[PDB]
Amino acid sequence: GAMVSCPICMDGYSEIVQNGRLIVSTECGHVFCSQCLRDSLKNANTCPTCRKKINHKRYHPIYI
Amino acid sequence: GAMVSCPICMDGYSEIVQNGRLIVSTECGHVFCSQCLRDSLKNANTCPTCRKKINHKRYHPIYI
Ligand SMILES: OC[C@H]1O[C@@](CO)(O[C@H]2O[C@H](CO)[C@@H](O)[C@H](O)[C@H]2O)[C@@H](O)[C@@H]1O
Ligand SMILES: OC[C@H]1O[C@@](CO)(O[C@H]2O[C@H](CO)[C@@H](O)[C@H](O)[C@H]2O)[C@@H](O)[C@@H]1O
Ligand SMILES: [Zn+2]
Ligand SMILES: [Zn+2]
Ligand SMILES: [Zn+2]
Ligand SMILES: [Zn+2]
């Protein structure tokens, strides 16, 4: 358990994990829920926060 | 701001960031404070949690 919020949907950890989503981080350290990041990746290969490229799986779950 | 705790020192986010440390994640998704992970890396090249190899900078800050 943790208290972190996804900046795209603005849900808290409780709401994210209740819905079966993962907390994920880009390799540039930007944290989102899995759904928002994967959805962003359908339209853009860049980090939603800093626009560094994150395709080729330069992101991963964080187990918190 | 976030509420996460480092499993090695067991400090909360407030105490970690007050002390100038970073929150970091391994690429295997395991979250620590920077001091504990870097200290672990002096003795072992493996994740403190799952023992997957994490040297060659297979870890990074998470900005929460
Ligand atoms: O929802 C992700 C969140 O759940 C935790 C347990 O609190 O991990 C569990 O759920 C994941 C998603 O189904 C699994 O991948 C994982 O193996 C399981 O322990 C947190 O670690 C994670 O942040
Ligand atoms: O202590 C890390 C923690 O601080 C935040 C702000 O709450 O980031 C700031 O501090 C970092 C460490 O000095 C800097 O690298 C960063 O640029 C700065 O914004 C969090 O994002 C971070 O988790
Ligand atoms: Zn989200
Ligand atoms: Zn980024
Ligand atoms: Zn620690
Ligand atoms: Zn690990």
**Order of strands, widest sheet of chain A:** 2-1-3
Computed Rg of chain A: 11 Å
Beta-strand portion of chain A reads 15-25%
Share of helix among residues of chain A? 25-40%
What's the structural domain tally of chain A?
Answer: 1
CATH C-level class of chain A is: Alpha Beta
Globally, the shape of chain A reads: globular
Order of helices and strands of chain A: HEEHE
The largest contact between protein chains, plus residue counts on each side, is: A-B, 14 and 14 residues
**Ligand identities:** a molecule of 2 linked components (GLC-FRU), zinc ion
PDB class: transcription
Keywords: transcription, zinc-finger, metal-binding
Assembly: dimeric
Entry title: Ring domain
Describe the structure.
2 copies of one chain form a homodimer. Chain A has 64 residues and is an alpha+beta fold. Chain A has a single domain (1-64), classed as 2-Layer Sandwich (Herpes Virus-1), CATH 3.30.40.10. Chain A has 2 helices and 3 strands, in the order αββαβ. Chain A has helices at residues 13-18, 34-43, and strands spanning 23-26, 31-33, 59-61. Chain A has a 3-stranded antiparallel β-sheet. In chain A, β1 (23-26) and β2 form a beta hairpin. The N and C termini of chain A lie close together (6 Å). The interface between A and B is medium-sized, with 14 and 14 residues.
